[PDB]
Amino acid sequence: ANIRVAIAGAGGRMGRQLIQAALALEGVQLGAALEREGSSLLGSDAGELAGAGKTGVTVQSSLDAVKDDFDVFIDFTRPEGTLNHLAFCRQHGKGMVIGTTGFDEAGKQAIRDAAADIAIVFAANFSVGVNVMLKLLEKAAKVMGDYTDIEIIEAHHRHKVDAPSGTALAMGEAIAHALDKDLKDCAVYSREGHTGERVPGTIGFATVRAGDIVGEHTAMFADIGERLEITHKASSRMTFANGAVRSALWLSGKESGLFDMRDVLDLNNL
Amino acid sequence: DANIRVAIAGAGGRMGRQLIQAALALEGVQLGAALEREGSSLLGSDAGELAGAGKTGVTVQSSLDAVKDDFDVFIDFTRPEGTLNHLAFCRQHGKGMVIGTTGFDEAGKQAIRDAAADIAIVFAANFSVGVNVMLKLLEKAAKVMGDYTDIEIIEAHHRHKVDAPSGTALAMGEAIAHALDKDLKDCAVYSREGHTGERVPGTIGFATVRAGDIVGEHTAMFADIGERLEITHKASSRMTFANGAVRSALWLSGKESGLFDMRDVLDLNNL
Amino acid sequence: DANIRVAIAGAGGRMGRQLIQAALALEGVQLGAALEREGSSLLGSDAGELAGAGKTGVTVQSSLDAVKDDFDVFIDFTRPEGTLNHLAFCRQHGKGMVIGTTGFDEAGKQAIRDAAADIAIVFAANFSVGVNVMLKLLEKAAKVMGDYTDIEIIEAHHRHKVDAPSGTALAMGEAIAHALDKDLKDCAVYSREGHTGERVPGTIGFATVRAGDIVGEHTAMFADIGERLEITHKASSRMTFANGAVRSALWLSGKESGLFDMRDVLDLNNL
Amino acid sequence: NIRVAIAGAGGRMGRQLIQAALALEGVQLGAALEREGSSLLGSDAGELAGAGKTGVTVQSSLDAVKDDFDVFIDFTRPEGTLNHLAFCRQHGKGMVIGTTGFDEAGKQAIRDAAADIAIVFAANFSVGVNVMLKLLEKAAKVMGDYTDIEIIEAHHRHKVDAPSGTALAMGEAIAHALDKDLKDCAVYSREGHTGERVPGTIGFATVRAGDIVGEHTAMFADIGERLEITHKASSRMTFANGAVRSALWLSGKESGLFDMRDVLDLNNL
Ligand SMILES: NC(=O)C1=CN([C@@H]2O[C@H](COP(=O)(O)OP(=O)(O)OC[C@H]3O[C@@H](n4cnc5c(N)ncnc54)[C@H](O)[C@@H]3O)[C@@H](O)[C@H]2O)C=CC1
Ligand SMILES: NC(=O)C1=CN([C@@H]2O[C@H](COP(=O)(O)OP(=O)(O)OC[C@H]3O[C@@H](n4cnc5c(N)ncnc54)[C@H](O)[C@@H]3O)[C@@H](O)[C@H]2O)C=CC1
Ligand SMILES: NC(=O)C1=CN([C@@H]2O[C@H](COP(=O)(O)OP(=O)(O)OC[C@H]3O[C@@H](n4cnc5c(N)ncnc54)[C@H](O)[C@@H]3O)[C@@H](O)[C@H]2O)C=CC1
Ligand SMILES: O=C(O)c1cccc(C(=O)O)n1
Ligand SMILES: O=C(O)c1cccc(C(=O)O)n1
Ligand SMILES: O=C(O)c1cccc(C(=O)O)n1
Ligand SMILES: [K+]
Ligand SMILES: [K+]
């Protein structure tokens, strides 16, 4: 490994995962692991925290302490925290992969500034698969969009509280925009009672909520005689981790900047 | 020697065209009549040529009494309102029905319920084998896993279907609900839009896809943490419901009165 | 209608009956000929009754030269051996060709490859739009996720298909393989039976289901730990390949010589 | 109080089984075992199964801990499992086997051992699958005769036996509901020009890829329609809790070999 990461909030589920990714992903090294001061788990050799442990890395909780230890900060904690780690990384030119999510207009507008000073990367979804699908969608909608019926089906564990999934909507948008139309115009979220006929050109959504489903999404292009279905299935929350690590590694060669998975994955030339 | 005659309501519709050739190609049945609305640009059209199988001699017409002696069993796969009269009339004159129309409001359901008093009806939400079998397997599952799992039903049908969810879906819902001493009206969820809460435990949700030429795909899902069971039926051609409805008509041979369904016909009132 | 006459190999088969009505009903195309096996119980019959309705001016037979002036493009959807014969014919006789037959051994594949020298052939493993698009999307996916994910291909077809896996599956295999600078022959795994080891990395496996009337279902799977992408195509009716092949024959028209596939036809090579 | 021996504690089922037992009131982590010189033969069975610590440690000997458990939970490989039998028999020990891939002979040995000891031998320890297994008999009963039957299963990249033992169990369920024996009509591979699917058959398709815990599909195909029954396992924990409660429930029986069905009480519809 020729580069060091910095899994913030190292002790949580995200962090843990993130640590695993750190190990596995060929080409990255675990330079650091942070955690809330005074948390009992301060001190354990990171690796140990997530399965296999040999790491010469001990979970600290001092930003400035580890200043030396990494090459790029991988932040997936709550906002404020994130905001702060950011000013640091900017002040020190450290580089970050912002998995964190939920900023206000001045948060995103904050991350904007930081950009010139340093190489940030910022995505709403660190899944390679997903980001890819999202692209493939444009392609399909392009060719078959016009004449086929488009439906989007998603399913998530019983606890999710927003319908449909934000990813579904993203899919909706991808398609909608590849067809010069706006999702607000042709979205159909419910089909109940005497509906009538599937209106030409509308996109429909079906939402399943059950069990521990991490996340299953299906894009459907239906014609008479054939249909194409593009589907993504997330088995563990690792998916995103793998995304961020790859993302992180990607940054290995830049000074300033603001990106997302398209850039990383190199998808506009796809 | 011979055999029964069948009235085929709304012979123009996609089910009509299926039903007709169905009756034609099958033993024990003679295409009694064919019917249609008044605006139909096809009254008087020859039955079989309408459905490809050449001229027959039967002609679509908009009148019950006009052909009232041309059949024994009335096969209805139109729309509720329509079916209602077919219902009424068939009573007075007393001819056995076979209804496959869906989307009945609780009241209509009652009328059918009433009419069965003197005439015999085979009212089913689906006329395939698979579905009926499934309908049963569901009771079994719900029995064991019903209590603790999350139950969802997903169905998909071609772009032209106008009632949501499929009458079959609802039949599945009912099968489950009743195997769990509860009534579907209580725990059904048809729409999930905007920030809803957590899945109010106990419910049985529905997801409806409408697209293309999908004949019919239905899935019953019993989800737990760690595992889920999915029972799924897929109809590849409308001919399956046709053969289903005809043989039902057939089953009605010698039946004086009452309400039955596919499970009765195929006889699956518990395996 | 206008112009182009089409020879329809093995007019008896399910693809024949589709192809025929396809050509009939489709503008710019005339049912040139119809063909069949050496002792088919179908010889001497008029194409339009077998598949379709309404007797016409074309009757089937077992000879190339017997109708050698009755068409321009030869549409083949028979079996390799058969198809091979035809190929010589159409070549020595400057006729265009549109092949959708599957299951060619690497040698036959060379002959087609050869013949393309003077005549124009449209050789594809699938004649639907969807599949062709998919085929492309695959390159894209394999590009990004090919390297680290496990790739598996699953296909299912009605009980009568006789070549495994589907020629389409193989085509998908190839699409992927070549997008990853590797050759399918190197990493294909067709069977998984009994004890066997850890899935050898970089291998493209195939699972083949054969059952019922399945027109055609194909799935491309890119599996990683934590997520998997599945691209799937489902053909509900044979008509899609028919319209595909007809359009092809209309396209071939003019090309003095050439070797192409549906991607060239549909013009997708730059998507 | 039912102490449990956990064979092959390193394996993915081991790590699950372990925390499973720890987590459960009533069973106590009896022992932990492993293979001749395991890269980690020894240490705290706790650390093994996720972060933290427990009194226990693991070893390569039956007798070395022979008094440390009551029920032996085996989820290793056939060969291994074989030995643990007679031992788990002679020394009168209740076993619960979830290992798969047994040749007809081994299956007999288990069959034999049940004479004096109690075994719960199942190819799958989840509820779903077991129920399914039943529903299958029902379906095959009605539609078995005329439809085409195919079984498709998919599992993570590491599985080494094809097809899944669960698949075969499904195969069997069906076969026997139709008075026929799977050996007669099983088709495992479809490669090259092969004629029309042979009418009586049950075929299998095997997918091996990624981290797939386990997906199984039973398909009854007719012309015009098809019924698909499908089970999906999202986490190995389900089989774990399954095996533990097996063992647990197995306490007290004099002897006999048993399937997850009996435990679950489903044999009666
Ligand atoms: N039980 C089963 O297996 C199936 C039930 N159905 C249900 O049966 C019905 C059939 O729809 P499709 O077959 O697609 O046919 P369709 O959707 O093409 O139209 C139905 C037919 O009934 C006629 N009709 C319509 N309104 C009428 C009225 N007011 N009075 C008398 N006749 C009228 C129409 O003119 C046409 O003949 C629907 O309710 C559908 O949901 C459909 C398929 C299968
Ligand atoms: N690329 C595509 O879109 C598609 C390709 N195919 C492939 O094309 C072929 C067509 O399958 P089907 O037509 O459904 O089979 P089929 O059951 O219809 O048999 C083929 C027909 O060709 C005739 N024929 C048979 N053997 C012949 C021979 N040795 N020489 C000359 N003529 C012969 C047969 O009499 C019959 O008419 C298969 O290889 C199939 O997999 C099928 C569908 C689509
Ligand atoms: N019936 C059910 O509910 C389930 C059945 N299984 C079956 O159980 C087996 C488990 O394989 P995995 O869980 O992936 O384990 P794995 O692939 O992680 O290997 C199993 C563990 O046991 C050890 N062990 C291996 N050979 C041994 C031997 N000869 N004697 C004693 N110990 C040995 C291995 O070192 C390793 O620690 C397979 O045959 C699998 O198909 C797995 C999960 C659930
Ligand atoms: O239960 C239903 O509503 C149903 C079942 C089969 C077909 C159709 C249909 O084509 O509308 N509708
Ligand atoms: O790739 C193939 O082999 C193929 C593709 C479409 C249909 C069929 C077929 O029905 O045999 N075969
Ligand atoms: O019946 C089986 O073969 C089976 C069941 C569950 C898991 C596994 C496995 O992970 O190998 N194998
Ligand atoms: K024409
Ligand atoms: K315990």
Side-chain angles (χ1 to χ4, degrees), chain A residues 1-15 17-38 40-43 45-53 55-66 68-77 79-90 92-104 106-107 109-111 113-183 185-253 256-270, chain B residues 2-3 5-39 41-54 56-91 93-184 186-271, chain C residues 2-54 56-91 93-184 186-271, chain D residues 1 3-52 54-182 184-269:
Chain A
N2 318 252
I3 192 172
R4 304 178 303 293
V5 302
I7 304 162
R13 293 169 231 240
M14 205 64 267
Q17 300 270 203
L18 271 176
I19 275 90
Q20 310 216 48
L23 319 197
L25 196 271
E26 231 288 2
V28 276
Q29 192 186 318
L30 207 214
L34 272 60
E35 190 61 41
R36 179 182 219 61
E37 167 87 277
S40 48
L41 277 59
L42 189 38
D45 213 327
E48 310 185 301
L49 199 38
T55 2
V57 151
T58 79
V59 45
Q60 276 174 241
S61 77
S62 169
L63 257 339
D64 218 331
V66 274
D68 64 273
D69 293 272
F70 67 62
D71 289 309
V72 52
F73 202 74
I74 305 194
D75 189 349
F76 278 60
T77 78
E80 348 77 1
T82 326
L83 280 316
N84 309 341
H85 299 84
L86 192 173
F88 182 26
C89 294
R90 86 177 276 168
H92 283 245
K94 295 309 254 146
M96 29 188 342
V97 141
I98 310 62
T100 304
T101 123
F103 308 136
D104 77 319
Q109 287 198 78
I111 296 178
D113 315 299
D117 307 51
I118 193 59
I120 290 140
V121 159
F122 179 18
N125 194 294
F126 282 72
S127 161
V128 175
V130 170
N131 272 278
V132 184
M133 172 172 104
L134 227 26
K135 208 64 186 177
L136 294 188
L137 262 52
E138 299 174 333
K139 303 297 161 183
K142 186 78 242 312
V143 165
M144 304 175 56
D146 282 309
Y147 59 101
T148 56
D149 289 305
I150 290 165
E151 298 275 294
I152 299 179
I153 316 154
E154 61 96 338
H156 283 100
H157 55 77
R158 75 158 68 69
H159 306 112
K160 193 161 177 64
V161 301
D162 55 322
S165 73
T167 302
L169 293 142
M171 290 159 82
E173 251 159 284
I175 289 169
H177 299 328
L179 298 187
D180 283 75
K181 39 222 303 281
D182 182 75
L183 210 159
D185 318 326
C186 59
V188 190
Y189 302 115
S190 74
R191 280 170 175 147
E192 168 192 38
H194 180 271
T195 61
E197 286 201 345
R198 158 102 171 67
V199 177
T202 54
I203 313 267
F205 296 97
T207 303
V208 172
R209 289 296 182 260
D212 66 353
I213 301 166
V214 186
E216 295 182 329
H217 291 91
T218 295
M220 173 167 85
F221 290 116
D223 191 25
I224 63 282
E226 70 178 335
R227 58 163 138 126
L228 230 209
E229 299 178 315
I230 306 184
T231 297
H232 177 282
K233 298 172 174 169
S235 57
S236 137
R237 275 192 76 117
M238 188 67 194
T239 307
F240 309 65
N242 289 200
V245 153
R246 288 158 176 285
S247 318
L249 160 53
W250 185 61
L251 291 178
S252 76
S256 152
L258 194 179
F259 311 107
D260 43 74
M261 286 313 277
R262 298 200 269 111
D263 304 282
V264 173
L265 241 18
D266 182 34
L267 301 185
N268 296 334
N269 186 77
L270 247 201
Chain B
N3 47 47
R5 309 196 296 302
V6 294
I8 294 186
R14 34 208 174 258
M15 269 311 280
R17 317 245 199 90
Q18 297 293 152
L19 279 173
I20 284 173
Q21 58 172 294
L24 250 39
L26 297 171
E27 308 332 310
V29 194
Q30 299 180 63
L31 201 184
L35 280 82
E36 206 41 282
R37 289 219 48 184
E38 262 272 307
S41 71
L42 69 173
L43 289 310
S45 190
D46 174 82
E49 56 145 3
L50 164 285
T56 44
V58 175
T59 77
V60 14
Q61 25 191 320
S62 61
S63 172
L64 286 333
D65 23 56
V67 283
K68 72 179 193 56
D69 262 278
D70 296 359
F71 62 90
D72 310 320
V73 189
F74 190 103
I75 285 177
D76 201 339
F77 277 58
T78 55
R79 300 304 166 68
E81 332 83 353
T83 306
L84 293 176
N85 334 319
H86 304 32
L87 192 285
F89 188 94
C90 290
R91 302 203 60 189
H93 309 22
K95 284 251 162 48
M97 303 229 224
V98 167
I99 319 187
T101 289
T102 56
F104 290 113
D105 54 73
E106 68 309 286
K109 300 154 103 171
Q110 196 31 37
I112 288 79
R113 196 138 248 300
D114 286 347
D118 28 69
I119 49 145
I121 311 179
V122 156
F123 185 20
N126 195 100
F127 279 87
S128 73
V129 167
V131 174
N132 283 277
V133 177
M134 171 171 103
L135 225 30
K136 210 60 191 180
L137 298 184
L138 263 50
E139 297 173 335
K140 304 297 163 181
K143 185 77 243 311
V144 166
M145 304 175 59
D147 283 306
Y148 60 99
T149 53
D150 286 311
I151 288 165
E152 298 275 299
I153 299 175
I154 317 153
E155 64 95 339
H157 283 103
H158 54 76
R159 73 159 69 69
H160 305 115
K161 190 161 181 65
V162 301
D163 54 322
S166 71
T168 301
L170 293 141
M172 285 159 78
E174 248 160 287
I176 287 169
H178 300 326
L180 299 186
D181 283 74
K182 38 221 304 280
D183 182 79
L184 208 158
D186 319 325
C187 62
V189 191
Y190 301 116
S191 74
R192 281 172 173 146
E193 167 194 38
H195 126 238
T196 62
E198 305 222 320
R199 198 183 177 299
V200 180
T203 67
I204 298 180
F206 296 97
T208 302
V209 171
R210 290 295 181 260
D213 62 354
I214 301 170
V215 185
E217 296 182 333
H218 291 90
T219 294
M221 169 169 85
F222 290 116
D224 193 23
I225 63 281
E227 70 175 339
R228 56 165 137 124
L229 229 211
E230 295 180 322
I231 307 178
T232 292
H233 176 283
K234 299 170 173 167
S236 55
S237 91
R238 236 158 308 220
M239 188 40 64
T240 325
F241 313 126
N243 304 339
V246 157
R247 302 138 163 285
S248 311
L250 241 175
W251 199 79
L252 299 128
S253 125
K255 268 62 162 207
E256 184 104 83
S257 155
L259 202 167
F260 319 37
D261 73 47
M262 275 308 274
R263 283 179 282 82
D264 312 78
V265 168
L266 301 109
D267 173 37
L268 318 165
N269 293 116
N270 212 356
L271 299 142
Chain C
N3 302 228
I4 351 167
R5 307 198 297 303
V6 295
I8 293 185
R14 33 209 176 259
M15 265 313 280
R17 317 247 199 88
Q18 298 291 152
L19 278 172
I20 286 174
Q21 60 173 295
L24 251 38
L26 259 56
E27 277 312 280
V29 109
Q30 268 160 281
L31 202 184
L35 279 81
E36 205 41 282
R37 292 205 69 18
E38 321 328 293
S40 344
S41 114
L42 273 213
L43 289 308
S45 186
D46 169 72
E49 40 172 78
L50 349 175
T56 64
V58 185
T59 51
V60 101
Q61 58 219 262
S62 61
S63 172
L64 286 333
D65 23 58
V67 285
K68 71 182 192 56
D69 263 281
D70 296 1
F71 62 87
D72 311 317
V73 188
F74 190 104
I75 282 174
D76 205 338
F77 278 56
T78 58
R79 303 301 167 68
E81 332 80 355
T83 305
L84 268 163
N85 302 321
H86 316 359
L87 171 69
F89 185 45
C90 303
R91 175 168 188 231
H93 296 38
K95 297 307 178 64
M97 239 186 316
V98 170
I99 322 185
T101 287
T102 56
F104 289 113
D105 53 73
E106 67 310 287
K109 303 151 100 173
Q110 194 33 36
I112 289 80
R113 195 138 249 300
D114 284 348
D118 28 70
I119 49 146
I121 311 180
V122 154
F123 187 19
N126 196 101
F127 278 90
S128 79
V129 168
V131 175
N132 286 272
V133 182
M134 175 167 95
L135 227 28
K136 208 65 190 175
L137 295 183
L138 264 52
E139 296 173 337
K140 303 297 161 183
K143 185 79 243 311
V144 166
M145 303 177 58
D147 284 307
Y148 60 98
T149 57
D150 287 309
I151 288 163
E152 300 271 297
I153 295 176
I154 318 152
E155 63 91 340
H157 282 99
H158 55 78
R159 74 157 68 68
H160 306 112
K161 191 164 178 62
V162 302
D163 51 322
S166 72
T168 301
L170 293 139
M172 291 155 79
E174 249 160 288
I176 285 165
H178 300 326
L180 297 187
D181 283 74
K182 39 221 303 281
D183 181 75
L184 209 158
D186 319 325
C187 61
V189 190
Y190 302 117
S191 73
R192 280 169 175 150
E193 165 193 40
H195 178 100
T196 23
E198 295 269 48
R199 172 175 144 74
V200 202
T203 65
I204 289 62
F206 294 97
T208 298
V209 170
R210 292 293 184 259
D213 65 354
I214 297 166
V215 187
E217 296 182 330
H218 292 91
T219 295
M221 170 166 87
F222 289 116
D224 191 26
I225 65 281
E227 71 180 335
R228 61 162 131 127
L229 228 211
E230 294 180 320
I231 303 181
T232 296
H233 175 284
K234 300 171 173 169
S236 55
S237 90
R238 234 157 311 219
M239 189 39 60
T240 324
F241 311 126
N243 306 337
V246 160
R247 227 138 146 320
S248 305
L250 268 56
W251 191 84
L252 258 197
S253 72
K255 278 78 170 182
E256 179 222 19
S257 68
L259 221 193
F260 340 69
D261 43 57
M262 277 286 266
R263 282 184 267 140
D264 288 303
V265 186
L266 282 299
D267 172 57
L268 281 171
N269 272 298
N270 282 50
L271 208 224
Chain D
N1 43 99
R3 304 198 297 302
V4 294
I6 291 186
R12 34 209 173 257
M13 269 312 279
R15 321 246 198 88
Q16 298 292 151
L17 277 170
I18 285 175
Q19 57 172 296
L22 249 38
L24 262 178
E25 298 299 70
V27 294
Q28 300 102 211
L29 204 183
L33 278 83
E34 207 39 282
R35 73 159 217 265
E36 228 105 60
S38 309
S39 161
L40 208 270
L41 179 75
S43 270
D44 194 355
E47 250 257 286
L48 191 285
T54 82
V56 217
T57 62
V58 204
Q59 46 205 286
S60 66
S61 171
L62 287 331
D63 23 57
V65 283
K66 70 179 194 57
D67 261 280
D68 298 359
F69 63 87
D70 309 319
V71 187
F72 190 102
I73 284 175
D74 201 339
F75 278 58
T76 55
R77 301 302 167 66
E79 334 81 355
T81 305
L82 287 179
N83 310 356
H84 318 170
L85 313 189
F87 177 86
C88 241
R89 178 187 179 191
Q90 291 163 7
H91 317 40
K93 289 304 173 69
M95 221 164 8
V96 167
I97 321 189
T99 289
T100 55
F102 290 117
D103 55 73
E104 67 310 287
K107 301 152 102 171
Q108 192 34 34
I110 288 78
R111 197 137 247 300
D112 285 348
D116 27 71
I117 50 144
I119 312 178
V120 157
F121 188 18
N124 199 99
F125 277 88
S126 73
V127 168
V129 175
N130 284 275
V131 182
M132 170 171 105
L133 224 30
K134 210 61 189 178
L135 295 185
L136 264 52
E137 297 172 336
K138 303 295 158 183
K141 184 77 244 310
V142 166
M143 304 173 56
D145 282 308
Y146 59 97
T147 53
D148 287 311
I149 291 163
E150 300 271 298
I151 297 174
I152 317 150
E153 61 90 344
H155 284 101
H156 55 73
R157 73 159 69 68
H158 309 113
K159 189 158 182 70
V160 301
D161 52 323
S164 73
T166 301
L168 294 141
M170 289 159 82
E172 249 160 286
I174 288 167
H176 300 326
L178 296 188
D179 283 72
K180 40 219 303 281
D181 182 73
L182 207 157
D184 320 324
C185 64
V187 192
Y188 302 117
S189 75
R190 279 168 176 149
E191 168 191 39
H193 173 300
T194 84
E196 297 200 9
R197 159 191 177 56
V198 183
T201 68
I202 299 260
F204 293 98
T206 299
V207 172
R208 290 295 183 259
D211 65 353
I212 300 165
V213 186
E215 293 181 334
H216 292 91
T217 293
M219 170 166 89
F220 289 116
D222 193 22
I223 64 279
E225 69 175 335
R226 59 165 134 127
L227 233 206
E228 295 180 321
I229 303 177
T230 294
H231 177 283
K232 298 173 170 167
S234 53
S235 90
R236 238 158 307 219
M237 192 40 67
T238 324
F239 312 126
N241 304 334
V244 162
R245 293 149 190 232
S246 283
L248 176 154
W249 164 108
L250 155 148
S251 93
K253 287 76 188 172
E254 194 232 12
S255 66
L257 210 189
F258 316 110
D259 299 338
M260 255 307 271
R261 283 169 254 167
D262 321 62
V263 178
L264 296 181
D265 197 15
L266 316 171
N267 295 298
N268 113 64
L269 240 289

